[PDB]
Design a protein around this ligand. Structure first.
Ligand SMILES: OC[C@H]1O[C@H](OC[C@H]2O[C@@](O)(CO)[C@@H](O)[C@@H]2O)[C@H](O)[C@@H](O)[C@@H]1O
Length: 404
């Protein structure tokens, strides 16, 4: 009978790949269907390039793909329209915002699987050791606390200790960190949902200059090569006061034999001043049935299972990844394991989106311009003022003649 083949998530990032293959195998066993799991590179933009090879070839060799929240506009031609397979009631069990994200020109490209948002991880033991009673609310506070804790920890002999780690590698994760910096300084959304390229402004420039000011100071020099797992590993070995990362790092940092188990909390990222908006970049994964799958019916059943209440629950409890079902945020087991889901739910719902809706199929080119110009500031090659001006010019070229 059929073999349903699934490309999604990466065994190179936390436990996602392993857990996903487990879920797929469990569906296989439950239904008596053969399945195979195809692994992927770590970085989402590398995964896109890989999957684009299959799509270009109209390959039937993958039936289901896990896609990023930024992809529906790019991948729509390669997606089976899911809309005929779900009732309005079934669809309403997911966050409307994400269903809408995943719907391009009325086609439901994919089902919401897990969402995501950038948050601040902090060492509560260290904050208390140094006389602080709350995590920082402003970037200036983050910097002050990071300087003082680092000076103390370094003096006590931890030469590996830093104040802050984040994603500064030139790749999609940097676009995410940078949208947070820019938006939390009142500098806008880089490209606004109406199409306006707003990024050339003094607040955005300041946000980038501030980030530059972290590099090799409160953050490792090597941060300009860090993706999610590089940041996480410095943090999880106990060597960073703060980290910007996604929810998944929480369950990993609490696991038995984690050096930082019980020593950390999470909160909303800081901002420039009390009247700036809170910034958490919207991330996450959706499940797409390939337009080139020879087994659409079976693929859709697998996607419905993966997106189901109990599989999302398992994802939440075991991997601390965010459900796309509002009902799971009131589930007693989910909340008992992850009490911060309740506190940060409004942060997750107000998460700020990268400009994938407005750039559509050109999003990946837009994002590359963003991470390359941002990276130039992080390395001290350009000032934020120059970079945001060059970025405006590049995005104008990229999006000239594109309409949403
Ligand atoms: O790097 C940008 C990318 O970050 C997040 O996805 C990357 C991986 O992070 C996870 O651990 C989930 O938090 C893995 O499951 C992902 O493969 C975010 O979800 C993306 O939207 C974002 O583009």
């Amino acid at each position: 009978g059929p073999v349903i083949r699934v490309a999604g998530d990466s065994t190179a990032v936390g436990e996602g790949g392993r857990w996903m293959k487990e879920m797929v195998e469990a569906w296989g066993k439950k239904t008596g269907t053969r399945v195979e799991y195809i692994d992927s590179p770590a970085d989402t933009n590398d995964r896109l390039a890989l999957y684009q090879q299959y799509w270009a070839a109209r390959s039937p060799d993958v039936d289901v793909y896990m896609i990023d929240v930024i992809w529906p506009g790019i991948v729509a031609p390669h997606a089976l329209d899911l809309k005929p397979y779900l009732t309005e009631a079934e669809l309403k069990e997911f966050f409307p915002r994400i269903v809408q994200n995943n719907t391009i020109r009325g086609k439901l490209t994919s089902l919401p699987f897990f969402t995501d948002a950038g948050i601040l991880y902090y060492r509560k033991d260290l904050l208390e050791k140094y006389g602080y009673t709350s995590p920082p609310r402003t970037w200036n506070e983050l910097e002050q606390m990071a300087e003082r804790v680092m000076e103390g920890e370094r003096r006590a002999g931890n030469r590996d200790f830093w104040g802050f780690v984040f994603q500064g590698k030139p790749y999609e994760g940097l676009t995410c960190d940078a949208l947070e910096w820019i938006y939390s300084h009142g500098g806008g959304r880089i490209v606004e949902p109406d199409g306006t390229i707003s990024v050339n402004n003094g607040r955005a420039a300041l946000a980038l200059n501030r980030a530059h000011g972290w590099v090799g100071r409160i953050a490792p020099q090597g941060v300009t090569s860090y993706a999610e797992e590089e940041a996480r590993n410095v943090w999880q070995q106990g060597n960073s006061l703060f980290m910007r990362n996604w929810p998944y790092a929480y369950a990993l940092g609490q696991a038995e034999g984690s050096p930082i188990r019980g020593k950390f909390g999470v909160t909303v990222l800081p901002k420039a001043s009390a009247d700036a908006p809170n910034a958490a970049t919207l991330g996450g994964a959706q499940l797409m049935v390939s337009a080139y799958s020879r087994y659409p019916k079976e693929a859709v059943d697998l996607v419905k299972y993966l997106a189901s209440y109990e599989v999302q629950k398992d994802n939440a409890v075991r991997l601390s990844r965010l459900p796309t079902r509002p009902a799971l945020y009131t589930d007693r087991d989910v909340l008992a394991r992850n009490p911060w889901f309740r506190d940060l739910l409004p942060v997750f719902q107000n998460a700020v989106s990268r400009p994938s809706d407005v750039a559509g199929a050109r999003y990946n080119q837009v994002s590359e311009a963003i991470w390359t110009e941002v990276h130039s500031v992080l390395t001290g090659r350009k000032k934020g003022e120059q970079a945001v001006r060059d970025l405006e010019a590049r995005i104008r070229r990229i999006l000239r003649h594109h309409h949403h």
